[PDB]
Design a binder for this molecule. Structure first.
Ligand code: HEC
Ligand code: HEC
Lengths: 126, 126
């Protein structure tokens, strides 16, 4: 759905802005600095789940640009792995939010953060 | 969830990038230039429905900036109307996509476009 490589870049940086907001806005709740309302978090995590599947389809062949390292494309199986791993971690977050269990949520949340960071360390330009 | 006014602006332009892509990518299908696969459109419209509720929460008080006219805030009831109208039009698109009826989809799609444009004409800076 992208007329030019720039349009895919702009889409994926857009989608990652939204995902980072929907994940990071929960930080105060995971830390106990903000109140935990199960319904409110369940809802926000559903939003995050839909957003978390969107960036990956905007690294199609020929969308080099942005801060994406070229190795996303020369090692596509490994990049595919990292994103499936991250998406599985979002499943576990969903399950914790759907269970309304804050301890489970905080552990899920740390696993999700580690997997964001694992991918950036291999595939996002310093 | 926004530390500064700029963060809300950046979030809402992000969310509208995504919504414009998920709506506009259907244009060739509504026109008959691309094939109509009901399941594929049903899915994309679900994505669009979640995305279409996201921008509105990022025009909270104090997030002036971007190409948002100040009248979004001095006339908040009317702006609220326009967005509820637009979101209702996305419900009708959903219903057409869920029914797998292309004629209904094309009509829904035109109604959705008109309501995007109606709001821009009143509240988006030329
Ligand atoms: C690969 C499997 C990744 C996973 C998992 C996550 N991110 Fe990511 N991120 C990735 C790339 C290749 C890039 C660069 C994209 C480009 O073309 O520039 C990024 C970028 C970001 C950014 C900055 C983007 C911008 O606005 O230009 C942010 C804020 C970001 N990523 C956040 C983020 C979060 C919160 C994640 C888990 C919840 C996450 N990323 C996972 C690759 C990957
Ligand atoms: C108000 C009720 C709106 C509705 C309905 C739609 N849009 Fe919108 N749009 C609105 C505003 C106030 C703004 C400016 C936001 C800012 O702070 O700059 C916009 C902007 C856009 C943009 C350009 C954004 C950018 O990347 O900076 C686009 C591409 C856009 N809007 C598309 C769009 C579509 C496709 C809509 C219906 C599907 C739609 N908008 C509805 C206000 C409103």
């Amino acid at each position: 759905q992208f007329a030019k490589p720039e349009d895919a870049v702009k889409y994926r940086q857009s989608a990652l802005t939204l995902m980072a907001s929907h994940f990071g806005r929960m930080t105060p709740v995971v830390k106990g600095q903000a109140p935990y309302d199960a319904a409110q978090i369940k809802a926000n995590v559903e939003v995050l789940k839909t957003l978390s599947a969107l960036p990956w389809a905007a690294f199609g062949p020929g969308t080099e640009g942005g801060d994406a390292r070229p190795e996303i494309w020369s090692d596509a199986a490994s990049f595919k792995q990292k994103q499936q791993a991250f998406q599985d971690n979002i499943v576990k977050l969903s399950a914790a939010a759907d269970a309304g269990d804050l301890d489970k949520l905080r552990a899920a949340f740390g696993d999700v953060g580690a997997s964001c960071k694992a991918c950036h360390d291999a595939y996002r330009k310093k």
